[PDB]
Design a protein around this ligand. Structure first.
Ligand SMILES: CN[C@@H](C)C(=O)N[C@H](C(=O)N1CCC[C@H]1C(=O)N[C@@H]1CCCc2ccccc21)C(C)(C)C
Ligand SMILES: [Zn+2]
Length: 117
């Protein structure tokens, strides 16, 4: 009888809120990165599974590990992390192992644009 302790009922105690993305996720993550920028909105980068450690740029992956630093102009987090170390929970779960595997094998994205501009 695996009772576990996660999915049962709401209101854990009082402080533990449901989630509130635009309160402790979007602004929280970004707040750790800073107004500074490089490619896309730091929030997008964080959504994939990234979080700054106070210092600008220096950001590490969640759970899967692997610290990323010195990003490259115009780059997505999904493909980036997936290549360096494809082992994220939400990432793999999102588009399944099939999608993650596809990335780590051949070039993807940046296609179907009339005629490469
Ligand atoms: C172009 N793609 C970019 C993101 C990229 O590969 N950057 C590379 C990069 O950051 N790499 C290479 C493998 C390991 C990783 C790296 O140096 N990571 C450093 C190592 C020291 C500790 C630490 C802590 C928090 C965040 C990053 C790191 C590097 C520029 C150092 C070659
Ligand atoms: Zn990761």
């Amino acid at each position: 009888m695996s009772d576990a302790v996660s999915s049962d009922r709401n209101f854990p105690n009082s402080t533990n809120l449901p989630r509130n993305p635009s309160m402790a996720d979007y602004e929280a993550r970004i707040f750790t990165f800073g107004t500074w920028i490089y490619s896309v909105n730091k929030e997008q980068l964080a959504r994939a599974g990234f979080y700054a450690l106070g210092e600008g740029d220096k950001v590490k992956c969640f759970h899967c590990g692997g610290g990323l630093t010195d990003w490259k102009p115009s780059e997505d987090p999904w493909e980036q992390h997936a290549k360096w170390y494809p082992g994220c929970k939400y990432l793999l779960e999102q588009k399944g192992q099939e999608y993650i595997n596809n990335i780590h094998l051949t070039h993807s994205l940046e296609e179907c644009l009339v005629r490469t501009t």
